[PDB]
Protein backbone atom coordinates (compact mmCIF):
# COMPACT_ATOMS: atom_id res chain seq x y z
CA UNK A 1 0.00 0.00 0.00
CA UNK A 2 1.12 3.56 -0.74
CA UNK A 3 -0.45 4.76 2.50
CA UNK A 4 -0.65 3.12 5.90
CA UNK A 5 -1.61 4.26 9.37
CA UNK A 6 -2.55 2.73 12.71
CA UNK A 7 -3.25 3.98 16.20
CA UNK A 8 -2.86 2.47 19.67
CA UNK A 9 -4.54 4.82 22.18
CA UNK A 10 -3.69 2.13 24.76
CA UNK A 11 -2.35 -1.42 24.66
CA UNK A 12 -4.98 -4.07 25.58
CA UNK A 13 -3.58 -7.55 26.27
CA UNK A 14 -5.37 -8.95 23.20
CA UNK A 15 -2.73 -8.16 20.54
CA UNK A 16 -2.60 -9.57 17.02
CA UNK A 17 -0.35 -7.28 14.97
CA UNK A 18 2.58 -6.78 17.33
CA UNK A 19 5.81 -8.76 17.10
CA UNK A 20 7.24 -9.20 20.61
CA UNK A 21 10.97 -9.82 21.00
CA UNK A 22 13.00 -10.47 24.15
CA UNK A 23 11.21 -9.61 27.40
CA UNK A 24 8.62 -7.25 25.92
CA UNK A 25 5.02 -7.88 26.99
CA UNK A 26 1.65 -6.27 27.72
CA UNK A 27 0.73 -5.29 31.27
CA UNK A 28 -1.89 -2.84 32.48
CA UNK A 29 -2.80 -1.72 28.96
CA UNK A 30 0.76 -0.65 28.22
CA UNK A 31 3.81 -2.22 26.66
CA UNK A 32 6.50 -3.10 29.19
CA UNK A 33 9.59 -3.34 26.99
CA UNK A 34 11.85 -4.40 29.86
CA UNK A 35 11.19 -7.20 32.36
CA UNK A 36 9.33 -6.44 35.58
CA UNK A 37 8.82 -8.64 38.66
CA UNK A 38 5.49 -9.64 40.22
CA UNK A 39 5.41 -6.40 42.20
CA UNK A 40 5.74 -4.52 38.93
CA UNK A 41 9.29 -3.40 39.68
CA UNK A 42 12.15 -3.27 37.12
CA UNK A 43 14.96 -5.84 37.10
CA UNK A 44 18.50 -5.71 35.70
CA UNK A 45 19.85 -7.44 32.60
CA UNK A 46 16.71 -7.27 30.47
CA UNK A 47 16.02 -6.39 26.83
CA UNK A 48 12.75 -6.10 24.93
CA UNK A 49 11.41 -4.86 21.59
CA UNK A 50 8.18 -4.69 19.57
CA UNK A 51 7.45 -4.18 15.88
CA UNK A 52 4.19 -3.66 14.00
CA UNK A 53 3.68 -6.76 11.82
CA UNK A 54 2.66 -4.91 8.64
CA UNK A 55 5.67 -3.82 6.63
CA UNK A 56 5.98 -0.13 5.78
CA UNK A 57 6.92 0.89 2.26
CA UNK A 58 9.56 3.55 2.95
CA UNK A 59 10.67 4.23 -0.63
CA UNK A 60 10.19 2.88 -4.14
CA UNK A 61 13.09 2.87 -6.61
CA UNK A 62 10.73 2.08 -9.49
CA UNK A 63 8.72 5.29 -9.04
CA UNK A 64 11.37 7.45 -7.37
CA UNK A 65 9.01 7.96 -4.43
CA UNK A 66 9.95 8.31 -0.77
CA UNK A 67 7.55 8.17 2.15
CA UNK A 68 6.51 11.00 4.42
CA UNK A 69 5.89 9.58 7.89
CA UNK A 70 5.21 10.48 11.48
CA UNK A 71 5.18 8.51 14.67
CA UNK A 72 3.55 9.89 17.76
CA UNK A 73 4.04 8.12 21.05
CA UNK A 74 4.15 8.48 24.79
CA UNK A 75 6.24 6.67 27.38
CA UNK A 76 7.22 6.93 31.02
CA UNK A 77 10.15 5.55 33.02
CA UNK A 78 9.92 4.50 36.66
CA UNK A 79 12.21 3.10 39.33
CA UNK A 80 12.31 2.76 43.14
CA UNK A 81 15.70 4.48 42.99
CA UNK A 82 16.12 8.14 42.03
CA UNK A 83 17.62 7.32 38.62
CA UNK A 84 17.61 4.48 36.10
CA UNK A 85 19.03 2.98 32.90
CA UNK A 86 19.55 2.41 30.11
CA UNK A 87 16.91 3.93 27.85
CA UNK A 88 14.23 3.48 25.22
CA UNK A 89 14.32 3.98 21.46
CA UNK A 90 11.97 4.21 18.50
CA UNK A 91 13.54 2.59 15.43
CA UNK A 92 13.16 1.71 11.76
CA UNK A 93 14.95 -1.35 10.40
CA UNK A 94 14.81 -4.24 7.88
CA UNK A 95 11.70 -6.47 8.33
CA UNK A 96 13.62 -9.51 9.59
CA UNK A 97 15.50 -7.56 12.27
CA UNK A 98 16.06 -9.42 15.56
CA UNK A 99 17.72 -8.52 18.86
CA UNK A 100 21.49 -8.69 18.18
CA UNK A 101 23.57 -10.98 20.40
CA UNK A 102 25.00 -9.07 23.36
CA UNK A 103 23.12 -5.83 22.66
CA UNK A 104 22.13 -5.23 26.27
CA UNK A 105 22.75 -2.17 28.39
CA UNK A 106 23.84 0.90 26.46
CA UNK A 107 23.38 -0.87 23.14
CA UNK A 108 19.62 -0.63 23.74
CA UNK A 109 19.01 -3.97 22.04
CA UNK A 110 19.71 -2.29 18.71
CA UNK A 111 23.37 -2.99 17.91
CA UNK A 112 25.91 -5.79 18.19
CA UNK A 113 28.94 -4.85 20.34
CA UNK A 114 31.42 -5.77 17.61
CA UNK A 115 29.85 -3.51 14.97
CA UNK A 116 28.07 -0.89 17.11
CA UNK A 117 29.96 1.99 15.48
CA UNK A 118 30.52 0.46 12.05
CA UNK A 119 28.09 2.36 9.82
CA UNK A 120 28.71 -0.11 6.98
CA UNK A 121 27.59 -3.08 9.08
CA UNK A 122 24.19 -1.66 10.04
CA UNK A 123 20.83 -0.63 8.62
CA UNK A 124 18.85 1.26 11.23
CA UNK A 125 17.55 4.69 12.10
CA UNK A 126 16.67 5.29 15.73
CA UNK A 127 15.62 8.08 18.07
CA UNK A 128 17.02 7.20 21.50
CA UNK A 129 16.21 8.53 24.94
CA UNK A 130 19.38 7.97 26.93
CA UNK A 131 19.14 8.47 30.70
CA UNK A 132 22.96 8.64 31.04
CA UNK A 133 23.09 6.81 34.37
CA UNK A 134 26.59 5.37 34.73
CA UNK A 135 29.49 6.92 32.79
CA UNK A 136 31.50 6.80 26.31
CA UNK A 137 30.62 7.70 22.71
CA UNK A 138 27.69 10.06 23.35
CA UNK A 139 27.65 13.19 25.56
CA UNK A 140 28.08 12.77 29.32
CA UNK A 141 24.57 13.92 30.26
CA UNK A 142 21.07 12.58 29.60
CA UNK A 143 20.02 13.28 26.02
CA UNK A 144 17.82 12.48 23.05
CA UNK A 145 19.86 11.17 20.15
CA UNK A 146 19.31 10.46 16.48
CA UNK A 147 21.19 7.33 15.39
CA UNK A 148 21.93 6.45 11.76
CA UNK A 149 23.57 3.02 11.42
CA UNK A 150 25.58 3.68 14.60
CA UNK A 151 25.05 3.75 18.36
CA UNK A 152 27.09 6.98 18.27
CA UNK A 153 24.39 9.62 17.73
CA UNK A 154 24.89 11.99 14.80
CA UNK A 155 22.88 14.65 16.61
CA UNK A 156 21.76 15.12 20.24
CA UNK A 157 20.03 17.55 22.61
CA UNK A 158 20.12 17.75 26.41
CA UNK A 159 17.19 16.00 28.03
CA UNK A 160 15.74 15.60 31.55
CA UNK A 161 14.57 12.31 33.05
CA UNK A 162 11.48 12.62 35.27
CA UNK A 163 10.41 9.53 37.19
CA UNK A 164 6.90 8.38 36.33
CA UNK A 165 6.09 11.29 34.03
CA UNK A 166 4.85 10.65 30.50
CA UNK A 167 6.86 12.15 27.67
CA UNK A 168 4.92 12.89 24.49
CA UNK A 169 7.04 12.46 21.38
CA UNK A 170 6.49 13.37 17.74
CA UNK A 171 8.88 12.10 15.07
CA UNK A 172 8.42 13.20 11.49
CA UNK A 173 10.27 12.73 8.22
CA UNK A 174 9.79 15.03 5.24
CA UNK A 175 11.11 13.55 1.94
CA UNK A 176 11.24 16.91 0.14
CA UNK A 177 13.68 18.38 2.69
CA UNK A 178 14.97 15.09 4.08
CA UNK A 179 14.58 16.46 7.60
CA UNK A 180 13.91 13.98 10.38
CA UNK A 181 12.47 16.12 13.18
CA UNK A 182 11.93 15.13 16.79
CA UNK A 183 9.80 17.05 19.24
CA UNK A 184 9.31 15.85 22.80
CA UNK A 185 7.35 17.51 25.58
CA UNK A 186 6.27 16.95 29.17
CA UNK A 187 2.76 17.93 30.26
CA UNK A 188 4.05 21.12 31.89
CA UNK A 189 5.20 22.41 28.52
CA UNK A 190 8.92 21.57 28.77
CA UNK A 191 9.96 21.05 25.14
CA UNK A 192 12.96 19.31 23.51
CA UNK A 193 13.82 19.53 19.82
CA UNK A 194 16.46 17.92 17.61
CA UNK A 195 16.54 17.29 13.88
CA UNK A 196 18.83 15.86 11.24
CA UNK A 197 19.02 15.76 7.46
CA UNK A 198 19.24 12.22 6.11
CA UNK A 199 18.47 10.40 2.87
CA UNK A 200 16.59 7.30 4.04
CA UNK A 201 17.04 5.77 0.56
CA UNK A 202 20.76 5.25 1.11
CA UNK A 203 20.31 3.99 4.67
CA UNK A 204 17.38 1.56 4.64
CA UNK A 205 15.77 -0.96 2.27
CA UNK A 206 12.51 -0.12 0.45
CA UNK A 207 10.36 -2.06 2.91
CA UNK A 208 10.94 -1.79 6.64
CA UNK A 209 9.37 -2.47 10.02
CA UNK A 210 8.98 0.07 12.80
CA UNK A 211 8.83 -0.38 16.55
CA UNK A 212 10.51 0.23 19.89
CA UNK A 213 13.39 -1.20 21.88
CA UNK A 214 14.63 -0.77 25.45
CA UNK A 215 17.18 -2.29 27.79
CA UNK A 216 18.56 -2.26 31.31
CA UNK A 217 22.06 -3.44 32.11
CA UNK A 218 23.27 -3.35 35.70
CA UNK A 219 21.18 -0.28 36.44
CA UNK A 220 17.44 -0.58 35.79
CA UNK A 221 14.08 1.11 35.30
CA UNK A 222 10.83 0.28 33.54
CA UNK A 223 10.43 1.43 29.93
CA UNK A 224 6.67 1.68 29.51
CA UNK A 225 5.20 2.48 26.09
CA UNK A 226 1.76 4.01 26.70
CA UNK A 227 0.41 4.98 23.29
CA UNK A 228 1.45 5.02 19.65
CA UNK A 229 0.07 6.28 16.35
CA UNK A 230 1.82 5.96 13.01
CA UNK A 231 1.06 7.15 9.49
CA UNK A 232 3.05 6.93 6.26
CA UNK A 233 2.48 7.88 2.60
CA UNK A 234 4.73 7.55 -0.44
CA UNK A 235 5.31 10.91 -2.11
CA UNK A 236 6.74 11.90 -5.49
CA UNK A 237 10.03 13.71 -5.08
CA UNK B 238 -4.74 -1.09 17.23
CA UNK B 239 -8.07 0.71 17.68
CA UNK B 240 -7.79 2.26 14.20
CA UNK B 241 -6.22 1.02 10.98
CA UNK B 242 -6.11 2.28 7.42
CA UNK B 243 -4.33 1.48 4.19
CA UNK B 244 -4.69 2.47 0.57
CA UNK B 245 -3.68 0.87 -2.70
CA UNK B 246 -4.29 3.48 -5.42
CA UNK B 247 -2.76 0.80 -7.66
CA UNK B 248 -1.11 -2.59 -7.14
CA UNK B 249 2.60 -2.60 -8.07
CA UNK B 250 3.98 -6.14 -8.34
CA UNK B 251 6.21 -5.53 -5.31
CA UNK B 252 3.83 -6.41 -2.45
CA UNK B 253 4.63 -7.46 1.12
CA UNK B 254 1.37 -7.16 3.06
CA UNK B 255 -0.95 -9.18 0.84
CA UNK B 256 -1.88 -12.79 1.38
CA UNK B 257 -2.39 -14.41 -2.02
CA UNK B 258 -4.55 -17.54 -2.17
CA UNK B 259 -5.52 -19.70 -5.12
CA UNK B 260 -4.58 -18.28 -8.51
CA UNK B 261 -4.57 -14.62 -7.46
CA UNK B 262 -1.58 -12.59 -8.62
CA UNK B 263 -0.50 -9.10 -9.61
CA UNK B 264 -0.43 -8.23 -13.31
CA UNK B 265 -0.12 -4.74 -14.80
CA UNK B 266 -0.53 -2.87 -11.52
CA UNK B 267 -3.79 -4.69 -10.80
CA UNK B 268 -4.76 -7.83 -8.93
CA UNK B 269 -6.01 -10.61 -11.21
CA UNK B 270 -8.04 -12.76 -8.84
CA UNK B 271 -8.80 -15.46 -11.40
CA UNK B 272 -6.27 -17.12 -13.72
CA UNK B 273 -5.41 -15.75 -17.16
CA UNK B 274 -3.38 -17.30 -20.00
CA UNK B 275 -0.26 -15.85 -21.63
CA UNK B 276 -2.34 -13.54 -23.83
CA UNK B 277 -4.07 -12.21 -20.73
CA UNK B 278 -7.37 -13.92 -21.46
CA UNK B 279 -9.55 -15.60 -18.77
CA UNK B 280 -9.65 -19.38 -18.42
CA UNK B 281 -12.16 -21.79 -16.86
CA UNK B 282 -12.02 -23.50 -13.46
CA UNK B 283 -10.09 -20.91 -11.46
CA UNK B 284 -10.39 -19.40 -7.98
CA UNK B 285 -8.32 -16.73 -6.26
CA UNK B 286 -8.39 -14.45 -3.22
CA UNK B 287 -6.25 -11.88 -1.41
CA UNK B 288 -6.35 -10.76 2.22
CA UNK B 289 -4.64 -7.85 3.88
CA UNK B 290 -1.93 -9.15 6.22
CA UNK B 291 -2.78 -7.14 9.35
CA UNK B 292 -5.79 -8.29 11.32
CA UNK B 293 -8.62 -5.81 11.79
CA UNK B 294 -10.07 -5.31 15.27
CA UNK B 295 -13.77 -5.43 14.32
CA UNK B 296 -15.22 -5.26 17.85
CA UNK B 297 -14.11 -5.49 21.47
CA UNK B 298 -16.07 -7.37 24.15
CA UNK B 299 -14.31 -5.68 27.07
CA UNK B 300 -15.00 -2.08 26.06
CA UNK B 301 -18.28 -2.87 24.31
CA UNK B 302 -16.97 -1.12 21.18
CA UNK B 303 -17.60 -1.87 17.51
CA UNK B 304 -15.68 -0.69 14.48
CA UNK B 305 -16.93 1.84 11.96
CA UNK B 306 -15.28 0.80 8.69
CA UNK B 307 -15.15 1.82 5.03
CA UNK B 308 -13.90 -0.16 2.04
CA UNK B 309 -13.67 1.73 -1.27
CA UNK B 310 -12.62 -0.25 -4.33
CA UNK B 311 -12.76 -0.49 -8.11
CA UNK B 312 -12.81 -3.50 -10.43
CA UNK B 313 -13.60 -4.50 -14.00
CA UNK B 314 -14.72 -7.73 -15.65
CA UNK B 315 -13.79 -8.78 -19.20
CA UNK B 316 -14.83 -11.83 -21.22
CA UNK B 317 -15.06 -12.77 -24.92
CA UNK B 318 -18.03 -14.96 -23.92
CA UNK B 319 -21.58 -13.58 -23.87
CA UNK B 320 -22.07 -14.94 -20.36
CA UNK B 321 -19.00 -14.27 -18.24
CA UNK B 322 -18.95 -15.86 -14.79
CA UNK B 323 -18.92 -16.21 -11.91
CA UNK B 324 -18.29 -13.09 -9.88
CA UNK B 325 -16.17 -11.21 -7.38
CA UNK B 326 -16.73 -10.55 -3.70
CA UNK B 327 -15.50 -8.31 -0.93
CA UNK B 328 -15.52 -10.32 2.29
CA UNK B 329 -14.74 -10.24 6.00
CA UNK B 330 -13.80 -13.50 7.70
CA UNK B 331 -11.77 -15.07 10.55
CA UNK B 332 -7.96 -14.56 10.33
CA UNK B 333 -7.16 -18.14 9.33
CA UNK B 334 -9.65 -18.29 6.46
CA UNK B 335 -8.57 -20.34 3.44
CA UNK B 336 -10.19 -21.38 0.15
CA UNK B 337 -12.71 -24.15 1.03
CA UNK B 338 -12.25 -27.39 -0.90
CA UNK B 339 -14.64 -27.43 -3.85
CA UNK B 340 -15.68 -23.77 -3.60
CA UNK B 341 -15.19 -22.92 -7.27
CA UNK B 342 -17.77 -21.52 -9.65
CA UNK B 343 -20.94 -20.24 -8.02
CA UNK B 344 -19.56 -20.64 -4.50
CA UNK B 345 -17.06 -17.89 -5.38
CA UNK B 346 -14.26 -19.48 -3.37
CA UNK B 347 -16.17 -18.48 -0.22
CA UNK B 348 -18.18 -21.53 0.88
CA UNK B 349 -17.85 -25.32 0.77
CA UNK B 350 -20.62 -27.25 -1.03
CA UNK B 351 -21.73 -29.22 2.02
CA UNK B 352 -22.39 -26.17 4.19
CA UNK B 353 -22.81 -23.31 1.71
CA UNK B 354 -26.36 -22.75 2.98
CA UNK B 355 -25.73 -23.67 6.63
CA UNK B 356 -25.47 -20.34 8.46
CA UNK B 357 -24.39 -22.06 11.68
CA UNK B 358 -21.41 -23.52 9.81
CA UNK B 359 -19.96 -20.25 8.49
CA UNK B 360 -18.46 -17.00 9.73
CA UNK B 361 -18.34 -14.52 6.89
CA UNK B 362 -19.95 -11.33 5.67
CA UNK B 363 -19.59 -10.68 1.97
CA UNK B 364 -20.82 -8.34 -0.74
CA UNK B 365 -20.95 -10.16 -4.07
CA UNK B 366 -21.29 -9.04 -7.68
CA UNK B 367 -22.75 -12.11 -9.37
CA UNK B 368 -22.88 -12.22 -13.16
CA UNK B 369 -24.00 -15.81 -13.79
CA UNK B 370 -30.09 -11.94 -13.71
CA UNK B 371 -26.79 -10.35 -12.60
CA UNK B 372 -26.99 -8.76 -9.16
CA UNK B 373 -25.31 -7.37 -6.08
CA UNK B 374 -25.89 -9.49 -3.01
CA UNK B 375 -25.12 -9.22 0.69
CA UNK B 376 -24.12 -12.57 2.19
CA UNK B 377 -24.21 -13.37 5.92
CA UNK B 378 -22.89 -16.86 6.74
CA UNK B 379 -24.52 -18.30 3.62
CA UNK B 380 -24.17 -18.35 -0.15
CA UNK B 381 -27.90 -17.59 -0.13
CA UNK B 382 -27.87 -13.79 -0.06
CA UNK B 383 -30.03 -12.15 2.62
CA UNK B 384 -30.85 -9.67 -0.13
CA UNK B 385 -29.97 -8.64 -3.66
CA UNK B 386 -30.62 -5.80 -6.09
CA UNK B 387 -30.51 -5.77 -9.89
CA UNK B 388 -27.16 -4.83 -11.41
CA UNK B 389 -25.74 -4.44 -14.91
CA UNK B 390 -22.53 -6.10 -16.09
CA UNK B 391 -20.58 -3.84 -18.44
CA UNK B 392 -17.64 -5.56 -20.06
CA UNK B 393 -14.36 -3.73 -19.50
CA UNK B 394 -15.90 -0.89 -17.47
CA UNK B 395 -14.66 -0.08 -13.97
CA UNK B 396 -17.19 -0.20 -11.18
CA UNK B 397 -16.49 1.97 -8.11
CA UNK B 398 -17.84 0.54 -4.88
CA UNK B 399 -18.11 1.91 -1.36
CA UNK B 400 -18.98 -0.48 1.46
CA UNK B 401 -19.53 1.02 4.90
CA UNK B 402 -20.64 -0.22 8.30
CA UNK B 403 -22.06 2.14 10.93
CA UNK B 404 -22.02 0.53 14.43
CA UNK B 405 -24.60 3.03 15.68
CA UNK B 406 -27.32 1.94 13.25
CA UNK B 407 -25.78 -1.45 12.50
CA UNK B 408 -26.31 -0.60 8.82
CA UNK B 409 -24.05 -2.17 6.20
CA UNK B 410 -24.35 0.17 3.19
CA UNK B 411 -23.25 -0.57 -0.37
CA UNK B 412 -23.03 2.06 -3.11
CA UNK B 413 -21.74 1.19 -6.59
CA UNK B 414 -21.34 3.43 -9.62
CA UNK B 415 -20.17 3.36 -13.22
CA UNK B 416 -18.31 6.37 -14.67
CA UNK B 417 -21.50 7.59 -16.35
CA UNK B 418 -23.32 8.04 -13.05
CA UNK B 419 -25.32 4.79 -13.11
CA UNK B 420 -25.87 4.06 -9.40
CA UNK B 421 -26.74 0.93 -7.39
CA UNK B 422 -27.59 0.90 -3.69
CA UNK B 423 -28.44 -1.75 -1.13
CA UNK B 424 -28.45 -1.68 2.68
CA UNK B 425 -28.81 -4.32 5.39
CA UNK B 426 -29.01 -4.17 9.18
CA UNK B 427 -26.70 -6.64 10.93
CA UNK B 428 -24.91 -6.97 14.27
CA UNK B 429 -21.40 -8.05 13.27
CA UNK B 430 -20.65 -9.11 16.86
CA UNK B 431 -23.01 -12.07 16.51
CA UNK B 432 -21.53 -13.04 13.15
CA UNK B 433 -17.77 -12.59 13.32
CA UNK B 434 -14.96 -12.91 15.88
CA UNK B 435 -13.40 -9.72 17.37
CA UNK B 436 -10.37 -9.90 15.08
CA UNK B 437 -10.83 -10.54 11.36
CA UNK B 438 -9.18 -10.21 7.99
CA UNK B 439 -10.58 -8.49 4.93
CA UNK B 440 -10.02 -9.28 1.29
CA UNK B 441 -11.55 -10.23 -2.04
CA UNK B 442 -12.51 -13.50 -3.70
CA UNK B 443 -13.42 -14.44 -7.26
CA UNK B 444 -14.00 -17.52 -9.39
CA UNK B 445 -14.94 -18.85 -12.82
CA UNK B 446 -16.46 -22.26 -13.43
CA UNK B 447 -17.29 -23.48 -16.93
CA UNK B 448 -18.05 -19.90 -17.98
CA UNK B 449 -15.27 -17.39 -17.34
CA UNK B 450 -14.15 -13.76 -17.16
CA UNK B 451 -11.27 -11.84 -15.65
CA UNK B 452 -11.88 -10.33 -12.21
CA UNK B 453 -9.53 -7.38 -11.94
CA UNK B 454 -9.19 -5.48 -8.66
CA UNK B 455 -7.85 -2.07 -9.70
CA UNK B 456 -7.68 -0.12 -6.43
CA UNK B 457 -8.55 -0.47 -2.75
CA UNK B 458 -8.63 1.77 0.32
CA UNK B 459 -9.75 0.64 3.76
CA UNK B 460 -10.16 2.37 7.10
CA UNK B 461 -11.50 1.15 10.43
CA UNK B 462 -11.85 2.67 13.91
CA UNK B 463 -13.40 1.31 17.12
CA UNK B 464 -16.31 3.35 18.46
CA UNK B 465 -18.61 3.29 21.49
CA UNK B 466 -21.99 1.89 20.46
Ligand SMILES: OC[C@H]1O[C@H](O)[C@@H](O)[C@@H](O)[C@@H]1O
Nearest residue numbers: 322341342343445446447448
Ligand atom coordinates in the same frame (compact mmCIF):
# COMPACT_ATOMS: atom_id res chain seq x y z
O1 LIG C 1 -19.12 -21.01 -14.39
C1 LIG C 1 -20.50 -21.31 -14.40
C2 LIG C 1 -20.80 -22.57 -13.59
O2 LIG C 1 -19.84 -23.58 -13.98
C3 LIG C 1 -20.14 -24.86 -13.40
O3 LIG C 1 -21.41 -25.24 -13.82
C4 LIG C 1 -20.10 -24.79 -11.87
O4 LIG C 1 -18.76 -24.61 -11.42
C5 LIG C 1 -21.00 -23.66 -11.34
O5 LIG C 1 -20.78 -23.47 -9.95
C6 LIG C 1 -20.73 -22.34 -12.08
O6 LIG C 1 -21.70 -21.37 -11.71
